[PDB]
From a paper:
[name] [name] is highly conserved with homologous DYNLL2 (dynein light chain LC8-type 2) in mammalian cells. Recent research showed that [name] regulated [name]-4 nuclear accumulation during apoptosis in [name] germ cells. [name], a suppressor of aph-1, contains an N-terminal GYF domain and two low-complexity domains in its mid-region. Therefore, we suggest that [name] binds to [name] to prevent [name] degradation and thus maintains an adequate level of [name] for the translocation of [name]-4 during apoptosis.
Author numbering:
A (entry chain D): 6 to 89
B (entry chain E): 181 to 203
C (entry chain C): 4 to 88
D (entry chain F): 181 to 204
E (entry chain A): 5 to 89
F (entry chain B): 4 to 89
The structure:
């Protein structure tokens, strides 16, 4: 796990990583991995979350304070933030 | 307050180069 | 280059404006990070906050968008995800 | 109302090929 | 005279590849410059990243994206052009 | 069988490995496409995809490679281009 950028509590940061670790174990497809993580965070911490999973993308997003994380798990980059 | 985030995947630096065999 | 709409929940005018705006972005930048910034900012001014934009060749996503405010399309080899939330 | 979107980039398929110049 | 030995590419791109290569041979004498012209042109026209080999005696093993590969002769000169990355 | 490095953007160990791998290739195969295939396949295995290899006596080239993953050299009278892109 490598955290590139984060404006989020340490407990949530750890929870995002755990949830993503679970996602990788269940799914191989980026589309499915993102779906799992988003739904999980929508259930645990209310809507509305958004998740991006891939190795090549650029992004410009707006997030609620203390609700944003961007990190790598192995060779895969994961963007997770709350907006709406 | 809402904050803006501008993040992107790591950039693999690329180089272009010429090669020519000798006569 | 050539615009190809894979998925869209958006008005025909807005879709075209998204394509035009993205076309300008590619002409302006080569970095995906910069291209996404231009598109988001442009749509924030034109169609009010809050928009989000993803630009790249390899990614998967699961997002929630307002109705009639979502488009996902290609410009050449580049995939562009644009939505309001 | 809010809608959910599940989209992902196309897979870029790679192919390998051999090439050999003709005998001069 | 154009002779296509092997190709995984659209007909429009193929013809554009031959024309582009035809221009290169008329302008340059050194193979590396001929290859540079073709590569640079296809990077601009059909997005990065392209690679080009020009010569009379070589063998190769390369990996290319699908529908982005051509191998042909212009007279006695062999031209390999493909996209990878 | 003299190795001559004309141009290189690559680690010394990788460079040395490129020469060794090519030496094996020339000993095993005589057709240039086969020599290139051997080297490419071997470097895809050792140092991950995606590599490309050109083997010949007369060619010019313009390619784009990842940093620290390019070598162009001769083994005797044969020129070998090897680089990673994608």
């Amino acid at each position: 796990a490598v955290i590139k950028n984060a404006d989020m509590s340490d407990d949530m940061q750890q929870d995002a990583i755990d949830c993503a670790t679970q996602a990788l174990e269940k799914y191989n497809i980026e589309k499915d991995i993102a779906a799992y993580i988003k739904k999980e965070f929508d259930k645990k911490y209310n809507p509305t979350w958004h998740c991006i999973v891939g190795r090549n993308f650029g992004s410009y997003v707006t997030h609620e304070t203390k609700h944003f994380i961007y990190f790598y798990l192995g060779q895969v980059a994961i963007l997770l933030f709350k907006s709406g | 307050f809402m904050q803006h985030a501008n993040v992107a995947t790591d950039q693999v630096v690329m180089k272009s180069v010429e090669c020519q065999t000798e006569p």
